[model samples]
Target: DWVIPPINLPENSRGPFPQELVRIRSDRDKNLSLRYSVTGPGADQPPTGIFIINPISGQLSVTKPLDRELIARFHLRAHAVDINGNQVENPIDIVINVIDMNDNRPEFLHQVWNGSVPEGSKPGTYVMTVTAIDADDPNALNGMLRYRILSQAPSTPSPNMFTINNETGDIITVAAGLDREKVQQYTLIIQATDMEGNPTYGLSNTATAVITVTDVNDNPPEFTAMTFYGEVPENRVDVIVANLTVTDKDQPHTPAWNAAYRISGGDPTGRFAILTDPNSNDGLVTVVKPIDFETNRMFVLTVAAENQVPLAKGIQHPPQSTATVSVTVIDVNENPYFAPNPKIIRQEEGLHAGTMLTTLTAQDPDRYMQQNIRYTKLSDPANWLKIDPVNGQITTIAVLDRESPNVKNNIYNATFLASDNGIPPMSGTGTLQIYLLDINDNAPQVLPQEAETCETPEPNSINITALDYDIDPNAGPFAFDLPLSPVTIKRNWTINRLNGDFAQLNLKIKFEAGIYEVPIIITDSGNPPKSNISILRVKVC
Candidate 1:
């Protein structure tokens, strides 16, 4: 028996069955006929009768064509013997190699691929990769793979938005305009072929690539209305004054689309503030301080709004700008005051009964209400004046006298009450200073008319500046002398003048510590001199 080189057999070779192979020979016997036989899996084993032998000519043969994918090679042993079935030669080994064939198609691991890309992504952005495998021999062209995009489902913004590598199968963006708002998802048909994508010679397969376009911020906010209008009642605070709504054509509820607002003008005092509504994307202008119609009746405001997140680059989107707002403050009816209270009406005293004087009308601050006022006499010290209940007219029921005690500083003072018909009612008091042309109605109301003193009192310390620190207190005095009617009062008292309507009334001597009621004469020094005798009480203890 001898070992020989292996035989190379091409797989998928079409042939008739029982094809003859190498012939076997026995060298020891001269002129003897020999037979050939093989023993292996493709021979007389489980795959029985695939390899056979001719007993007369010693020729080995194959029974059928073979598939290398099913069985790559065969291991067999051959024997040469005479016709009596006795072994004639040692067992010889034979090797057969099944050659490879261009058989299997390229197969993908998955039928579909999922990929994602952000909206507005630039060119050359990587998406994802695809892979394929072939069952044929790897070193040959039949097993080598190449990838390409067959067709993009949508032709939006150009048909060739994406591309793939021929060898790597990497998908990437080829052009711009991958806007998610316009197109969120796209489909692509990818093809992988053997023989370098040769149309006629290579095996090919197909798969789907579903590409998703995500979101980004590219739109700026815009005002829904160019101008807004609102109102506020007088002295109203902490109220929503107006609604400022805007629109952004971006993804909803995202930071790029949500709004924020500012009051740029017409609110220098910081009286108005803007609050953004998260759910509705509306800007609400609210009153932070009370709006008083008496101070500001109306306001024109400027408002600007924008998104929470800044806009993305690359688009020519117009920016958000300012808008106008008109806010009118309404008046809430308020109480009334006399148009000119302490009104001085001129008249000569000694007027006959039934004499007419000036009428006083009280005013109300109700811009939208009708308030009717009626007048009544509140104070008539001499019981000399009367008021018409319906017309607010003043008349002298009794004749006014200049020498009457009710007159002071040549003016007769009377106060009246004005009432209005409103909810819960409202009343106002006004003074009417009636001026008398002649004859003083009052002598003088002396300050510190009665004083208490120690047995030894300090002089010039008792000042005479009046409680009325206003006008007429500066009117210089004429005389401060003891009246001769009571001769004993002149012994201990003296008067002296100081600056700024101030005077000192002092004791000339530290006399007895006793209380003395003395009469003193004081006279007014005006163009119309009014003189009177005032009783002064002094206590010297």
Candidate 2:
């Protein structure tokens, strides 16, 4: 059932005993067949120079040299077979692992290198460091490693902006040539060798070294200050103080020369303000309040501008610098604005029914500020007068009765606030003077003039138009009739309600032409309204 016993073999035995004359014990007939072969790390490809097996004897044997350090043990599989080359039994597993020995030393990937430096640079500006690693015995010198840039690329400039430590892989700047504007970047070819750069016996490696020159605020900020001046009208509110301009040698956007400003002198009261324009790097001086002409008018405001960041480290220049500014204030005529400005108007007393009135108007000494200063009733106290926002005409939108409770001092008052849409939204107000005008149109006038003339064989037809002076579309196509004064006019005339409006004045009699005064009663369609009888004078000729 099994392939063979003695699956485990002894290490290191004298070789070539008929290769491998193995012993196979099984229920299968021995004559039936027993093919043999040896396999393992020492049995495959390179001819496993270590062992061999007898294909006929089923025996295994060892040959050639042996190295336990290289291969501590060998692994293999032994299978049984029949005479016809048929595998008759399960194969057995054999393992042999190698044991190591101390042999090779650590090696670097490179041998020599080159490095460069700027013409001038201070110590501490990074140059280049060479590094190397070991792989033998990490805990011992066999694998322990250090680095160095042995020499450099034209390693001159003596103690230039670069230097490397022989023991540590640290490279730093030496003198001062790190000006990116002068020479942007430097190149250095670095060398990394193990065993402390013992070039003869130690291994070596190398890489490129790049030293870039960074900018510093070594230059002071200069102002355009021989005779810089700005304008601000006297008594003018919210005026720009002055714009400060400057030039910086450092690169723009770098911390070196971005400008900031402050009033260093002359502005004792702090009436003028200065701010840095982030967009232009200029100082903006603005007037916080009105400037009086009679007071200290011309302000010789002294201002200072400086860079936003301190001087770069190792820079020999000053830590900070300042600029001077002189400001001059001008004088201009100003406007006299109104106080308690929103004038008021009363509804029931400001204007009578059907009346026109004029409201208050405004004027400014500086006429330029008065451009298109129209009136707007920001709020109506009594909600009566309607003022034209553009024209300042205060008219009665509703009837103004002096007896209404809204009237005060026989004058009901309401306030209107007015303003102009300007640069800063300047505003003023004046009281509205209203004189309520009255008219007798409050009484109703008759519908149609009752007068007509006709010749013989007259057509006896007329068209009449009626209208109301007030606005309420409810007033109507009125009913007109002879009041039956003597009870005879009704018999003489017949009426028809043809429509809501006009009625045909058809006379039932064929009579002579004459004049008649008909008393007609009319009514308005308003709630609980008033009615009146007016005289309709008509002449039938």
TM-score of each: 0.58, 0.41
Task: List candidate 2 stretches off by more than 4 Å.
Answer: 1-130, 134-146, 150-159, 176-184, 201-203, 213-218, 312-322, 334-541
**CA-RMSD of model 2:** 17.4
Q: Which model scores highest in TM-score? A: 1
On the 0 to 100 scale, the lDDT of residue 183 in model 1 is 82
Model 1, range 70-126, lDDT digits (tens) per residue?
887889888888767778778888877877777788888999999999987779999
lDDT (10s digit) by residue, model 2, range 246-271: 77777786667677677778778777
Candidate 1 lowest-lDDT run of ten: 465-474
The clash number for model 2 is 39
Q: Evaluate model 1: give its TM-score.
A: 0.58
